[PDB]
Design a protein around this nucleic acid. Structure first.
Ligand code: MG
Ligand code: MG
Ligand code: MG
Ligand code: MG
Ligand code: MG
Ligand code: MG
Ligand code: MG
Ligand code: MG
Ligand code: MG
Ligand code: MG
Ligand code: MG
Ligand code: MG
Ligand code: MG
Ligand code: MG
Ligand code: MG
Ligand code: MG
Ligand code: MG
Ligand code: MG
Ligand code: MG
Ligand code: MG
Ligand code: MG
Ligand code: MG
Ligand code: MG
Ligand code: MG
Ligand code: MG
Ligand code: MG
Ligand code: MG
Ligand code: MG
Ligand code: MG
Ligand code: MG
Ligand code: MG
Ligand code: MG
Ligand code: MG
Ligand code: MG
Ligand code: MG
Ligand code: MG
Ligand code: MG
Ligand code: MG
Ligand code: MG
Ligand code: MG
Ligand code: MG
Ligand code: MG
Ligand code: MG
Ligand code: MG
Ligand code: MG
Ligand code: MG
Ligand code: MG
Ligand code: MG
Ligand code: MG
Ligand code: MG
Ligand code: MG
Ligand code: MG
Ligand code: MG
Ligand code: MG
Ligand code: MG
Ligand code: MG
Ligand code: MG
Ligand code: MG
Length: 189
RNA sequence: UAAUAUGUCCAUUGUAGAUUUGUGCCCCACUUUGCAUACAAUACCGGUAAGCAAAUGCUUUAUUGAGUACGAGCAUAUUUGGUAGGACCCGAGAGGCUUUGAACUAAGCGUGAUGAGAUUGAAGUCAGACGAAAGUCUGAUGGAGGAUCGAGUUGAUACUGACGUGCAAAUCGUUCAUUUCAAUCACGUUUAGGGGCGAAAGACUAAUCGAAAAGCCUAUUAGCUGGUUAUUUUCGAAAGAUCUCUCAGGAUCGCUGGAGUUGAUUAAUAUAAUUUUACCAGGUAGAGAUAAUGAUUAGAGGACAGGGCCUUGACCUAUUCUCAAACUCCCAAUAGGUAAAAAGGGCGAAAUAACUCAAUUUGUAUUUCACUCAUAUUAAAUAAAAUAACUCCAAGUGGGCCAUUUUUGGUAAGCAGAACUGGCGAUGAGGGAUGCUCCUAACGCUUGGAUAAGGUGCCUAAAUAUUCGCUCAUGAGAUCCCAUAAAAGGUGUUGGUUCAUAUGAACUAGCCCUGAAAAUGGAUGGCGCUAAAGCGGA
RNA sequence: AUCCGACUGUUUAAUUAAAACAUAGCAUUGUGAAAAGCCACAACUGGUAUUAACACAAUGUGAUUUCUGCCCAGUGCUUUGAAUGUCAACUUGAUGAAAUUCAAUCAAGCGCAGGUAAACGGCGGGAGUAACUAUGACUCUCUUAAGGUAGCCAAAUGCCUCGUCAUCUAAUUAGUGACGCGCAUGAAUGGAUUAACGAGAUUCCCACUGUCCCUACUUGCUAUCUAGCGAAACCACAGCCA
RNA sequence: GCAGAUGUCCAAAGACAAGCUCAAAGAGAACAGAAAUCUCUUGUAGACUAAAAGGGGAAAAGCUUGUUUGAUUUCUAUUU
RNA sequence: AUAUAGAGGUGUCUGAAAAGUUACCACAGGGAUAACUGGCUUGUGGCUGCCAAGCGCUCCUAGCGACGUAGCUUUUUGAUCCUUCGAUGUCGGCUCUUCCUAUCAUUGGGACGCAGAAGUCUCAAAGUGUCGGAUUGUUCACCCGCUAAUAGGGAACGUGAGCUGGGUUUAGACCGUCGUGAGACAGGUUAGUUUUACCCUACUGAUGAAUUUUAUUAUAUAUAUACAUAUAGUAUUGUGACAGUAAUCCAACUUGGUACGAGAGGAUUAGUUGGUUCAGACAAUUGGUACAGCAAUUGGUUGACAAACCAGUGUUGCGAAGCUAAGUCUGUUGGAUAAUGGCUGAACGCCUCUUAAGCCAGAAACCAUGCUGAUUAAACAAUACUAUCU
RNA sequence: GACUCGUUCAUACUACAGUGGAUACACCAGAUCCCAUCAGAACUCUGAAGUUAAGCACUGUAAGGCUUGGCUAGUACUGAGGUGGGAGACCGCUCGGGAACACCAGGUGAUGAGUCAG
C-alpha cells in the first residue's frame, strides 16, 4: 500500500515530474487545494494566517490532503462554512518511485523550501485565533518543522493591511476574486 | 630503373645554432664564420597519379618510399629487453606410444568335491465306502517340488551396536538372509585396456576404474597458486585510457628509472596546475511561470451550444496558486581559452612571381637593404623558472579503496556508480583511549629550544587556573570523522519577544526532564566528577 | 490392512540389497546360408555353428487374471522404380591449336507414391442450455495427424494442498475408503486387478517389555594407581576474561 | 541510469536556379453539413523538412516549377 | 599470376568455422563470486509514539483510533557482498545453561464503558514459573487436555570431537512433467559410513608448597608505644572479607452464600489443612537391586550316596547388609526502597505528594539475616606444646 | 527636401491615429513587342492622365514591445576555510565572487559612400 513516509522525507533526487518520460503515474490524492468560500471578494476577509515550513522536505501528497481535510473540518466545527478561505499553496509534482534497477513511479510529493508557505487561511479579523488553531492542528500531520505565522498582509494580496486600506481610500486598486489588481499608471486610456 | 650536373675538387637555400675572426677574458652590442641539430624549403632518384607521347620516354604539375643532397659502418666485449627453447623454481586433469596383469574380482567352460537334521506330502499304487446311472468320496502308501524351517557354508538386514592415531586401509559382537539348486567351493583354463568381463551397480578388471597398471614420448601445457637467497645509498610508480573470444590475461599510451644529448649557468629568455589587464566562450546553481513548451489552482471581467430574461457550459481578456533531469526571457560563482614584442614587431624602399588584380606591379608572400622599438627592472606581477627540453632503452602497473564537496541508481547500506581535489595504497611520528583513510604533520642520525593538533583532577606530561553564565537527571553530560536518536510534550528551571489589564496570557529558545525497549557484565576510554573534572564562552 | 515388486534368484568387494536387474510368460523384428542373418578381424580368416525357422540373432515388456483405445501429419524404419526431380566418378559427345569449358547418361541415397505405433512418440479449447436454485445429458463454435478410450488416482504420479466428505484418535500435515475439468494419470513408457512370496515401503491393533514416566542397583572387561614398556595426530608463539 | 532510435529509405526526398509561404484562427461564397473547394484578413513558424531526438531553416534549408547528374575521377591537409 | 579500384563479410560489429549434459566427475584456482553466521541498512515483518475525523446509547481520548506522521528493534524476509572456498560441519528434535523484556501467570499498584464476579488498559516489577499429548523431518501450524499461566525472544538463526540423522544436499532406484537425447526439476518417493581430546584454556571436583617493603582495628602495666610489634614447626579452635544463594504456585474449606447486586450470581483479605513444582537431605517403613548367603532345580561330571563342581553370573525362590525412588523428612524475616498512595508545605496571598527543601506508608523486586565455599584473603586471630630466647 | 547602394539589425518592431507631398519615391494608365500567368493580380514591357488615398517619410499614444538605468539586493546562489552549529535536514561565521524575474524611471534611433532637386 504505502511506505513509512520517512523514506521520502528529504529532497534526494532531482525533481522528477509528470511528463512524456514518466507516463504511468497515479493521480495525486489532493485535488481541491482551495476550499471554504472560494468565491469571496478581497474586501471580505482581512485576517490572513500562513503555515510556514522551516524544513527542506518532500511532504507526501496524501499527507497534504489529510492536513487540508483536518483544517477544513476544524473550521466547519468552529465558525460558518463561508467565514474562511483555505488555500493549499503547495502542489505535488515530484513523483516518487518504488523498486520491488530503476524504480517504477508510485505516488507524488510536494517538495518545499525553508521559507515558503504550505497552507494559507484567509478569514475575518474576528476568527484569526480559530484559523491559527486549525493551522496548528494541520501541522500535526505534516513531517518536519512547521510554524503558524499571522501576516500583516490583507489576505493573499501582496499589500500590508494599512497600505491596502489607503489604496482603497484613493481607489488605486480593483478587486476581482480573491486576487486584486493595482492600477499602475501605465496603460492607454 | 637508380639520386643537383659539368656549368664548378666544387661540396643545394633558409631561420635559430657551437667555435672562430674582428671591433668598441667571461658577459654585452655589433660585425665575421654557420659544427651538430631542430625547423622548413627546394632539387633529384624509384614507384604511382596527371599531361603529353614514338624512346634514352619526355613535363612548368602532383603525390609516395623504410629515399638522396660528400658515406658510418663493421667486428667484439658486457647489459637489459623482447622471442624460442625445461626457460626463474615447484605444481595439474589429461593426449599418445609400447608393454604388463584375471594369484583379487567378473563371466564361461573342463575336472573334481560340498550342503547336520527336521517339516510339508504332488503324481502313481493299494485297500475300503456309496450310487437306477453317470460317477463320487475315505484310509494308507508313495516321496514330487528353482516347496518350509534350519546348523554349517555363502553372504551382509538391523543395531545406523563396538571399533574408528582399530585386531583390521572394512574388523568384532549380537541379530539376520541363504542351505538340492539360476546352489557353493577348489584347481585348471579361456577372455586384456577405449579392451575384457557385467542377472546392469558404470560394477569389477591385484587396496588402482565414468577407461587399469608400468615405462617412455615429458622437465607435456597452465593467462592459475605457492615460493623466488648479502648490505647501504639514490630515484621512485600504477591500479586511467584504447583494442583484445576481452573482464583473474595481454598489447600499446600514460606514470617511473636509468642512459645520453641539446641547453641553461648572462637572478635571463624558454617556461609555470598562479594571478592581471584585455578579450572571449558557456547556459550549471539561481530565477521565471500575467516570456515560449509542457504542466497547473482558483475565481473575476467579458460576447458560440443546450434547457425553461435566467442557469449550465466551453472561449477570450486581465489575473492568481505552484512547478520541470531529458523547459528557458535572463543568468552567476567556480572551472577554461587566447593576450601581454627582438627566430619578433613598426613605417619604408628596392627586388622575385608562372599567384592575385582592371592595373610589370594592383596587391600578396618571400628576400636584401633602410630607418628604430621598453631592456638592467627586465614591453603586467611573482617564481629553489634549465631540477629544462628532447631522444633512447626498459621496469613495474593496468583487481583499487577512502575523505570533504557536487552527484546518479537505490527505503537505505561500511551498497552499486560517477565528477573536482586530497589522501590511503607505498607512511611512519604527535593527537583522536582504541582504528589503512579524521586532525597535526610527512621521517638521516643527535643536543637544546619553541610550538602544532590536542589537551592540563588522577590514570597522563600540563591548571583541582582565573573569569561570567547556564544545567541536578529515581538510567545527566562530556569535543570533527565516531560509533546514533526523532515527532510530540513538560506550571523543571533559565533567559527573551509580543501583548494585555504585578498579575494574567500567548509564544520563543538554552540547558534539563519525558518520549527512550534485547539479549555475557560494562563502558564520556577507566576511575570518578555536580562552588564539574558537564555544557557555552572569555 | 495399504504401496511396490509376482514368485526362487542377482547386484553397487569398503556408505545404497531395493520398488533396481534377472526371471518364466507375452509380443515384435531380421535371416532359407558358406554371395544369408548378427557379430569379430589390420589382413587372410573366424565366431554363432558338431548350428538351420519348434533355429540363431536383435529388441521391448515382465507370472497369472482382465484388457491393450485413437492418431502414420513430425522423426524413424520399410516397400515399388526408367513414369520420375535431383544426385559422383567414369564414360560419351560438342568446342578449341591444346589445357580446359560445356552438355548428356537407368547408381544407390534422398524427393515423388504407399505400409507401419507390443517403432520413437502424441493424444483440445471456449460458450449456451432442464417449472425453488445448482449441474449440464443436449446445442453452437474455433481448431487438430488424432484430440486420452477401458480404466485409475491428491496412488512412490496433486502446484494450489495439510484438497472436501467419511473412517481410525481424547485429539491425525500420517493411514485407510470415497470423491476428481487429473498444474502434468493412463493402457507392453504397459493399464487395471491380484493368491503366494519379500532382512522390501507404509499405518493401526493385540501381546510384550526400562523405549519412556524416572531413574536405581548390579556384573565382567577398561578406565584408576603401581611395576614394566611405550607411540602418534597436532604444534608461528602461545594460552583468563568484558 | 533514465526517454528513445539504427542495420534502412530516396532518379529523387540528389544538384542548381526561379517563384511562392506554411500550421492554425477568424470572417465570408449554390448543393456543402464537424471535416470538400475558393477569397480575404492575421499569421517568427505554433507547419513542413524520409526516419529517433536535439539543433538549424521564411524572397528558405519548406512548398511549387524549370533545367539536370557533382550520388563523377584523382590527390592532399586534416576533425571526430 | 600480379599492380590499382570497387564489390561478395565477419552485427561477439579491430573481424575463430562450433551444440548439449554431468547428481559419476576430475584438476587449477577464486572469498575478485553464491548457498551459513556475523556486519552495515530496515524496504518488508514486529513493536512503540504523536495528531484526532469518527466509533464507543449521550461523550474525541474507559477502550479505541481513520486520514496522516515520528521512531525503535533485528525474534521475519530482503538488500548487500566486508569476512571465510589449502572447509567455521549446512535443518529440526532431543539435552543443558544463562541472558534479555517487548510480562502470559504470580507480588504490589493505578485506570475503566470497575456494583460483585469476570475481564480490559496501564505502571514498578524478569524473583519464581510457562507442561502432557495426537499429525508433520519439520521451525511454523493445528487440534485434544491439564494448568496460576501454558508470554515472546537471544546466545555463530546457542548447542553434531554432545547425540540423533527424519529432511535437505553425493553415488542406487521409481513416478510425474520437461528435454530428440544424455539428462533437468527452487516436483514428489525410498534406500543410503556422522572420524579424532591424550594438547592448552574453561568449567567440575582433588591435592598442595610458598608468601619481611610484607602485615597490623591494637598491645603493655590511668600512663605508654607504629622511632612499635610479628620468631618458626606442628595441632586444635575460630574470624569471615569476598564469592554463590532458594524456595514456588495452587486447591479445598472457614471468613460467607456474607459484602455487592433488581436478580442471577458472588469476592478481597486473613486463617486452617493439604497438595504441585523445585531444592537439600535421608532409608526406620514400602519398593528397587544380588558375584554376602541360604534353598530348589536342568544338562553334564566325579562308580553310587554324600559332597561338590561346569554351563562367560546355568536357571528359578527367597534374600540380610549397602546403596537407592516411585518412599520419608525439612525448606526463615528484617532494613532500605520502586511503582503507587499520602503527609507538612512553598513557588504562585489560594492550591499543590516535593512537577522545591523535609518527611511518611509501601513489591515474588534490592540488600542484609539465614544457608554453601572461603590456597575465592598468597588473609588473619587465639590457644596448646615445642626447637633455644633475650 | 529626396533617392540608391549600405552598416548596427526593434531606441529600427507592431497596433491605432494625425501631417506631408516642387524634384523625387510611390500608386496609377495601357498591352504592339521581350516576357509571365487560370488571371498584365504578380512578373515583364510601354507609358505620364491623375493622386497623396495607401506605400514611404515624419509625429502622436498616462500604448504593447524592445532598449539603457536604478531597484529588487548584497537577496538568491556560490569558490576557498573551519575538531563551526545542527540527531539529521540544513543553517551561520571567516576570506572572497555575486544573479534573475518583477517594479520604477528615461529612451524610441543612429550612420558610411554616392547622386539629385533649390
Ligand atoms: Mg515497517
Ligand atoms: Mg539518488
Ligand atoms: Mg620447470
Ligand atoms: Mg585430446
Ligand atoms: Mg582366479
Ligand atoms: Mg572362475
Ligand atoms: Mg549393505
Ligand atoms: Mg556403527
Ligand atoms: Mg574411541
Ligand atoms: Mg548412474
Ligand atoms: Mg611439469
Ligand atoms: Mg624520494
Ligand atoms: Mg589472485
Ligand atoms: Mg533549478
Ligand atoms: Mg521555483
Ligand atoms: Mg535545467
Ligand atoms: Mg597492492
Ligand atoms: Mg598520512
Ligand atoms: Mg574516540
Ligand atoms: Mg584541514
Ligand atoms: Mg627535541
Ligand atoms: Mg613549551
Ligand atoms: Mg600530571
Ligand atoms: Mg561514584
Ligand atoms: Mg580530562
Ligand atoms: Mg522380488
Ligand atoms: Mg556396498
Ligand atoms: Mg524388472
Ligand atoms: Mg503384471
Ligand atoms: Mg497402444
Ligand atoms: Mg536414382
Ligand atoms: Mg477419462
Ligand atoms: Mg499415529
Ligand atoms: Mg487414499
Ligand atoms: Mg502422459
Ligand atoms: Mg530374496
Ligand atoms: Mg614426532
Ligand atoms: Mg530560392
Ligand atoms: Mg568478498
Ligand atoms: Mg522497519
Ligand atoms: Mg580457513
Ligand atoms: Mg575443521
Ligand atoms: Mg568448530
Ligand atoms: Mg518493563
Ligand atoms: Mg496483562
Ligand atoms: Mg471485580
Ligand atoms: Mg538472528
Ligand atoms: Mg561443538
Ligand atoms: Mg560428528
Ligand atoms: Mg544440529
Ligand atoms: Mg536421512
Ligand atoms: Mg540419489
Ligand atoms: Mg534391601
Ligand atoms: Mg572340566
Ligand atoms: Mg526380591
Ligand atoms: Mg519549582
Ligand atoms: Mg496622408
Ligand atoms: Mg510603452
Amino acid at each position: 500500500g504505502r511506505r513509512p513516509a520517512r523514506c521520502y522525507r528529504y529532497c534526494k533526487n532531482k525533481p522528477y515530474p509528470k511528463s512524456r518520460y514518466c507516463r504511468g503515474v497515479p493521480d495525486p490524492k489532493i485535488r481541491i487545494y482551495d476550499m471554504g468560500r472560494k468565491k469571496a471578494d478581497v474586501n471580505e476577509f482581512s485576517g490572513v494566517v500562513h503555515l510556514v515550513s522551516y524544513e527542506y522536505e518532500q511532504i507526501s501528497s496524501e499527507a497534504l490532503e489529510a492536513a487540508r481535510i483536518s483544517a477544513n473540518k476544524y473550521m466547519i466545527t468552529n465558525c460558518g462554512k463561508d467565514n474562511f478561505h483555505l488555500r493549499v499553496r503547495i502542489h505535488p509534482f515530484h513523483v516518487l518511485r518504488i523498486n520491488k534497477a530503476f524504480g517504477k513511479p508510485n505516488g507524488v510529493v510536494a517538495r518545499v523550501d525553508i521559507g515558503q508557505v504550505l497552507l494559507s487561511i484567509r478569514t475575518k479579523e474576528n476568527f484569526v485565533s480559530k484559523a491559527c488553531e486549525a493551522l496548528r492542528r494541520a501541522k500535526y500531520k505534516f513531517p518536519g518543522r512547521q510554524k503558524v505565522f499571522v501576516s500583516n498582509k490583507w489576505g493573499f494580496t501582496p499589500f500590508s493591511k494599512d497600505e491596502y486600506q489607503q489604496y482603497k481610500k484613493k481607489g488605486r486598486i480593483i478587486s476581482d476574486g480573491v486576487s486584486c489588481k493595482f492600477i499602475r499608471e501605465k496603460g492607454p486610456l
